[PDB]
């Protein structure tokens, strides 16, 4: 929630990259459930969350 | 501007009696004047610039042999092209054919801006690119 | 009136006095070195004076563009329009051979935040989003420590530096991409979507981050901005050739005895810089084969060009290359030039975002062709084909990555075609 509040209200989708990174830290690797759970908290459709995970290299999908 | 024994020929051109068409194919046929729409699969527009003349379809059965699509209407594949509706609609009754005309559909101009893809307020901001 | 023998800068005029981390990089050391001093007066002078003194400085974009930073930053002198105004500092530093941004962040971060503060005031921005790359986690944490120190000291935040201005700095981490270094792609990645760059009929000054105005500036450019305000554009304009002022950093790497970093005055002779700061090419200067002047994007030049060339924008431009990021990579006579360039194209293929067709397909195609060139399994006609392909993607891509990948191929071809010819002949008679 501190990450989301860094961004302007109404564009909370911008927190996708840092929040998805947070799921990586407490899980090592992010499974599809982590990518779905990021979608619910950030209200972003899961497809857009899937785009970010596959595009950037650091996110360990395996 | 041509003195060639000019006489008053007001009555409409009625060449139908000369084209040799049988009586059946001259009244009971309803031709259609239309600008063909673009093939929705494609995006080009070079096929929607000339008015087309076509005859209403008729029976098309199957042969007792291997079974092609037989027909008995000679005016089935006849498609004519005209550069203007007035020329097209004039060729119909001059040849004596009942017609219906559909006006050309012009794609209305739509204002498109790339900056709208990333809008501060409006819901037109996209979620992917 | 003219300092023709440009170079050999002294410690007094050096900006990043704590470059090697030999002094306290916290607020106490930074203020000791001369930071956060009369900042309020800079704030109270007015944005016009800040912009005006940047033009006098003649500062050019130290990120791979070389644009007249004063002219670029002047694009938000327009009146307010309801939308918030935002500043963005580029800190990706993804270009190979570029290490300068890493050093300033983790050794003199307080200069950077002050740079955002004075920069934001000049451009009227509300906040600065420093986009540090994901790998620099320790650097980002070091950056945030300075931010917290500045916030507690009252330098930034509500009534920044006791001047009424309210400025905030959010340091946003990356998730791993070289394309995020691109300004519009960085603006995109901040917004949370895929890091593809956006086309520009519009510009960040009008439409940008969250749709609000923005301006992506390199870490070095903003970092030196406050010191320019303190010492003046006249002091900054004194150094460097005309239109080539300032003291640009230099990242020397490759086949050198002591690869390092140094803040040398611009328009410096290339031979001189390698000799003293770096230590000279391994095996002597005569062992040099080719040099990457300013990063992978900048095309290479051979030793013949390397004999006398000033390290700046214009001098390299007439030398069939560019200053770029001043990432000097030397390659000795023991270096497989074809193999090294093929690796650069391999890096570009692994970093293209795949949005536009020329960069998505052309770079991959150039990767496969150059791979055959390294082995020699090709024909002399392929060299010309590679030249035409590189031109096809040049200037036809959304962002400058396509041009950034075509230039190394063009640089290699025009300076080492006989090497390519010899390798293919070597492959030919071996496989007879
Ligand atoms: C593929 C690519 C990568 C780039 N990477 C960086 C980078 O890491 N850092 C940077 O400051 N500019 C980078 N740039 C340049 C930016 O797009 C932009 O021109 C510049 O950051 C603007 O700030 P400046 O005027 O201070 O250089 C890159 C450009 C391209 C095309
Ligand atoms: S040049 Fe490459 S990275 Fe840049 S927009 Fe096109 S595909 Fe994406």
DSSP calls for C115-144: HHHHHHHHHT-SEEEEEE-TT-HHHHHHHH
Of C193, C196, C194, B117, nearest in space to A13 by CA: C193
C205/B99 Cα distance (integer angstroms): 59
**What 3-state class would DSSP assign to B73?**
coil
Which among B117, B120, B129 has the least Cβ separation from residue C210? Answer: B120
Q: At what angle do helices C401-430 and C363-375 cross, to 10 degrees?
A: 30
* Ligand 1 lining (C-beta closer than 6 Å): C 61-65, 67, 69, 90, 92-95, 179, 181-183, 216-218, 221, 399-401, 404
**Strand pairing report for C310-311 and C268-269:** antiparallel
Q: Which two tokens stand for residue C118?
A: 């004075």
Instruction: Please list, in sequence order, all residues whose beta carbon lies within 8 angstroms of the beta carbon of residue C296, skipping any fewer than 6 positions away.
Output: C95, C96, C97, C327, C344, C347, C348, C404, C408
**What 3-state class would DSSP assign to A59?**
coil
Of C328, C191, C183, nearest in space to C261 by CA: C328
Kind and range of the H or E element at C382? helix C380-393
**Strand pairing report for C86-91 and C127-132:** parallel
Q: Is residue C302 within 8 Å of C290, Cβ to Cβ?
A: yes
Instruction: Please list, in sequence order, all residues whose beta carbon lies within 8 angstroms of the beta carbon of residue C383, skipping any fewer than 6 positions away.
Output: C413, C417, C420, C421
Q: Which two tokens stand for residue C44?
A: 């109270």
Chains contacting C with at least 3 CB pairs below 8 Å?
A, B
B114/B118 Cα distance (integer angstroms): 8
Q: Is residue A38 within 8 Å of A19, Cβ to Cβ?
A: yes
Q: Which two tokens stand for residue C294?
A: 């300013």
Structure-token match 């700046």, residue found = C312
**What 3-state class would DSSP assign to C221?**
helix
Q: Is B128's Cβ below 8 Å from some Cβ in C?
A: yes
Inter-chain touch B129–C188, beta carbons under 8 Å: yes
Tally: H helices and E strands in chain A: 4, 0
C269/C309 Cα distance (integer angstroms): 6
**What 3-state class would DSSP assign to C327?**
strand
Q: Which two tokens stand for residue C424?
A: 């293919």
Instruction: Please list, in sequence order, all residues whose beta carbon lies within 8 angstroms of the beta carbon of residue C120, skipping any fewer than 6 positions away.
Output: C87, C126, C127, C128, C165, C167
Bridge partners, C241 (sequence order): C244
Test mutation, B119, B121, B127, chain A, max A CBs within 10 A = B127
Distances from the Cα of B48 to the Cαs of B19, B81, B104, in angstroms? 29, 11, 9
CB under 8 Å, gap of 24 or more: what pairs does A7-11 form? Answer: A7/C170, A7/C210, A8/C84, A8/C210, A8/C212, A11/C191, A11/C192, A11/C210
Query: Angle at the Cα of C189 (from C184 to C192), degrees rounded to 5?
Result: 135
Tally: H helices and E strands in chain B: 2, 4
Distances from the Cα of B23 to the Cαs of B13, B18, C269, in angstroms? 18, 12, 97
CB under 8 Å, gap of 24 or more: what pairs does C48-54 form? Answer: C48/C77, C50/C118, C50/C121, C50/C122, C50/C229, C51/C77, C51/C122, C53/C228, C53/C229, C53/C232, C53/C233, C54/C122, C54/C225, C54/C228, C54/C233
Inter-chain touch B115–C199, beta carbons under 8 Å: no
Of C118, C119, C116, C117, nearest in space to C132 by CA: C116
Q: Is residue B73 within 8 Å of B58, Cβ to Cβ?
A: yes
For the CA atoms of B35, B38, B39, B41, the dihedral, rounded to the nearest 10 degrees, stands at: -160
Q: Is residue C322 within 8 Å of C90, Cβ to Cβ?
A: no
The atom number, within ligand 1, closest to the CA of C399 reads 31
Structural determination approach: cryo-EM
Terminal-residue alpha carbon distance, chain A: 27
Structure-token match 């050019």, residue found = C60
**What 3-state class would DSSP assign to B70?**
coil
C133/C93 Cα distance (integer angstroms): 7
Instruction: Please list, in sequence order, all residues whose beta carbon lies within 8 angstroms of the beta carbon of residue C342, skipping any fewer than 6 positions away.
Output: C367, C370, C371, C373, C374
Of C316, C297, C308, nearest in space to C270 by CA: C308
C417/A13 Cα distance (integer angstroms): 50
Of C293, C280, C238, C267, nearest in space to C7 by CA: C267
Number of residues assigned to chain A:
62
C134/B78 Cα distance (integer angstroms): 68
Q: Which two tokens stand for residue C327?
A: 């990432």
Q: Is residue B80 within 8 Å of B53, Cβ to Cβ?
A: yes
Positive or negative, the Cα torsion across C236, C239, C243, C246?
negative
CB under 8 Å, gap of 24 or more: what pairs does C364-368 form? Answer: C365/C389, C366/C390, C366/C393, C366/C405, C366/C406, C366/C409, C367/C342
Q: Is residue C47 within 8 Å of C233, Cβ to Cβ?
A: no
Q: Is residue C178 within 8 Å of C92, Cβ to Cβ?
A: yes
Chain A CA closest to residue B128: A48
C93/C96 Cα distance (integer angstroms): 8
- Residue B107 CB-density burial (10 A; 0-12 exposed, 13-18 middle, 19+ buried): exposed
Please report residues of C whose CB lies closer than 8 A to that of B128: 193-194
A41/A37 Cα distance (integer angstroms): 7
Question: Which resolution, in Å, applies to this structure?
Answer: 3.5
Distance of CA B12 to the CA centre of its chain: 23
C218 in a known ligand binding site: yes
Q: Which two tokens stand for residue C239?
A: 């150094």
C353/C195 Cα distance (integer angstroms): 7
**What 3-state class would DSSP assign to A54?**
helix
Please state the φ and ψ torsions of residue B100, each to the nearest 5 degrees. -130, 140
Q: Which two tokens stand for residue C101?
A: 């941004």
C176 in a known ligand binding site: no
Query: Angle at the Cα of C198 (from C409 to B108), degrees rounded to 5?
Result: 120
Q: Where are the alpha helices (DSSP H) in C19-73?
A: 27-33, 39-45, 47-57, 69-73
C39 in a known ligand binding site: no
Ligand nearest to the CA of C195: 2
Q: Which two tokens stand for residue C93?
A: 């530093």
Bridge partners, C130 (sequence order): C89, C171
Instruction: Please list, in sequence order, all residues whose beta carbon lies within 8 angstroms of the beta carbon of residue C358, skipping any fewer than 6 positions away.
Output: C392, C393, C396, C397, C402
Distances from the Cα of C403 to the Cαs of B96, C18, C413, in angstroms? 66, 35, 15
C352 in a known ligand binding site: yes
Q: Where are the alpha helices (DSSP H) in C192-281?
A: 219-238, 270-273
Instruction: Please list, in sequence order, all residues whose beta carbon lies within 8 angstroms of the beta carbon of residue A49, skipping any fewer than 6 positions away.
Output: A16, A20, A35, A36, A38, A39, A42
Of C210, C176, C201, nearest in space to C88 by CA: C210
Structure-token match 């450019």, residue found = C221
CB under 8 Å, gap of 24 or more: what pairs does C392-398 form? Answer: C392/C358, C392/C362, C393/C358, C393/C359, C393/C362, C393/C363, C393/C366, C396/C356, C396/C358, C397/C356, C397/C358, C397/C359, C398/C196, C398/C197, C398/C198, C398/C199, C398/C355, C398/C356, C398/C359
Tally: H helices and E strands in chain C: 17, 11
C230/C236 Cα distance (integer angstroms): 10
Q: Is residue C303 within 8 Å of C289, Cβ to Cβ?
A: yes
Terminal-residue alpha carbon distance, chain B: 67
- Residue B124 CB-density burial (10 A; 0-12 exposed, 13-18 middle, 19+ buried): exposed
C83/C166 Cα distance (integer angstroms): 16
b/e code A11-25 from CB counts within 10 Å (16+ = b): bbbbbbbbbbbebbe
A62/C253 Cα distance (integer angstroms): 34
C284/C276 Cα distance (integer angstroms): 13
For the CA atoms of C222, C223, C229, C235, the dihedral, rounded to the nearest 10 degrees, stands at: -110
Report the side by side order of strands in the sheet with C301-302: C260-263, C249-254, C327-332, C288-292, C301-302
Q: Is residue C121 within 8 Å of C47, Cβ to Cβ?
A: yes
C190/C193 Cα distance (integer angstroms): 8
B84/A12 Cα distance (integer angstroms): 56
Instruction: Please list, in sequence order, all residues whose beta carbon lies within 8 angstroms of the beta carbon of residue C9, skipping any fewer than 6 positions away.
Output: C239, C247, C263, C264, C265
Structure-token match 């190394």, residue found = C408
Query: Angle at the Cα of A36 (from A32 to A38), degrees rounded to 5?
Result: 120
C264/C191 Cα distance (integer angstroms): 36
Which among B115, B121, B129 has the least Cβ separation from residue C196? Answer: B129
Q: Where are the alpha helices (DSSP H) in C58-182?
A: 69-73, 100-107, 109-123, 137-153
Query: Angle at the Cα of C19 (from C18 to C22), degrees rounded to 5?
Result: 50
Q: Is A13's Cβ below 8 Å from some Cβ in B?
A: yes
Q: Is residue B127 within 8 Å of A48, Cβ to Cβ?
A: yes
Q: Which two tokens stand for residue C34?
A: 């001369």
| Neighbour count for residue B85 (Cβ, 10 Å) | 16
C314/C320 Cα distance (integer angstroms): 10
Structure-token match 């070095």, residue found = C220
Instruction: Please list, in sequence order, all residues whose beta carbon lies within 8 angstroms of the beta carbon of residue C228, skipping any fewer than 6 positions away.
Output: C53, C54, C57, C59, C235, C236
């Amino acid at each position: 929630e501190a990450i989301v509040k860094n961004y302007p209200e109404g564009h909370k989708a911008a927190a996708v990259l840092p929040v998805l990174d947070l799921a990586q830290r407490q899980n090592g690797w992010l499974p599809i459930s982590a990518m779905n759970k990021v979608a619910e908290i950030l209200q972003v459709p899961p497809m857009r969350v899937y785009e970010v995970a596959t595009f950037y290299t650091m996110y360990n999908r395996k | 501007t041509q003195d060639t024994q000019l006489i008053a020929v007001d009555e409409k051109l009625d060449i139908t009696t000369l084209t040799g068409v049988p009586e059946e194919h001259i009244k009971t046929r309803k031709v259609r004047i239309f600008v063909p729409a673009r093939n929705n699969m494609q995006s080009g527009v070079n096929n929607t610039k000339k008015w087309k003349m076509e005859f209403d379809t008729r029976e098309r059965w199957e042969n007792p042999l291997m079974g092609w699509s037989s027909t008995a209407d000679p005016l089935s594949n006849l498609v004519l092209t005209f550069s203007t509706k007035e020329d097209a609609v004039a060729f119909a009754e001059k040849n004596g054919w009942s017609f219906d005309v559909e006006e050309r559909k012009v794609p209305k101009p739509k204002s498109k801006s790339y900056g709208a893809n990333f809008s501060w307020n409006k819901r037109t901001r996209v979620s992917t690119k | 009136p003219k300092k023709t023998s440009f170079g050999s800068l002294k410690d007094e005029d050096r900006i990043f006095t704590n470059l090697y981390g030999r002094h306290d990089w916290r607020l106490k050391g930074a203020q000791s070195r001369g930071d956060w001093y009369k900042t309020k007066e800079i704030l109270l002078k007015g944005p016009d004076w800040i912009l005006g003194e940047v033009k006098t400085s003649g500062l050019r974009g130290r990120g791979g563009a070389g644009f007249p930073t004063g002219l670029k930053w002047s694009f938000m002198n327009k009146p307010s329009d309801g939308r918030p105004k935002y500043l963005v500092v580029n800190a990706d530093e993804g270009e190979p051979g570029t290490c300068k941004d890493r050093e300033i962040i983790r050794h003199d971060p307080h200069k950077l935040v002050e740079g955002c503060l004075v920069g934001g005031r000049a451009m009227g921005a509300r906040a600065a989003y420093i986009y540090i790359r994901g790998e620099f986690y320790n650097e980002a944490s070091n950056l945030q420590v300075a931010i917290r120190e500045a916030y507690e000291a009252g330098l930034i935040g509500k009534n920044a530096c006791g001047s009424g201005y309210d400025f905030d700095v959010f340091v946003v981490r990356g998730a791993g991409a070289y394309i995020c270094g691109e300004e519009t792609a960085l603006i995109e990645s901040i917004e949370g979507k895929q890091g593809k760059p956006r086309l520009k009929p519009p510009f960040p000054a009008d439409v940008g981050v969250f749709g609000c105005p923005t301006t992506v500036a390199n870490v070095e450019t903003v970092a030196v901005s406050p010191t320019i305000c303190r010492r003046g554009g006249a002091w900054f304009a004194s150094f460097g050739r005309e239109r080539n002022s300032g003291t640009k950093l230099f990242n020397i790497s490759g086949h050198v005895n002591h690869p390092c970093t140094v803040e040398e005055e611009m328009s410096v002779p290339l031979k001189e810089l390698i000799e003293k700061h770096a230590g000279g090419v391994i095996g002597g200067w005569d062992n040099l084969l080719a040099v990457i002047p300013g990063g992978s994007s900048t095309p290479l030049i051979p030793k013949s060009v390397c004999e006398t060339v000033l390290m700046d924008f214009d001098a390299l431009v007439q030398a069939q290359t560019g200053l770029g990021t001043a990432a000097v990579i030397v390659m000795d006579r023991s270096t497989d030039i074809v193999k090294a360039i093929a690796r650069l194209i391999e890096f570009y293929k692994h970093e293209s975002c795949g949005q536009c067709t020329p960069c998505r397909e052309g770079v991959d195609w150039m990767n496969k062709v150059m791979a055959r060139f390294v082995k020699g399994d090709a024909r002399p006609a392929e060299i010309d084909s590679l030249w035409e392909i590189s031109k096809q993607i040049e200037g036809h891509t959304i962002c400058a990555l396509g041009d950034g990948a075509a230039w190394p191929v063009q640089g290699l071809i025009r300076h080492f075609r006989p090497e390519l010819e010899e390798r293919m002949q070597q492959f030919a008679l071996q496989h007879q």
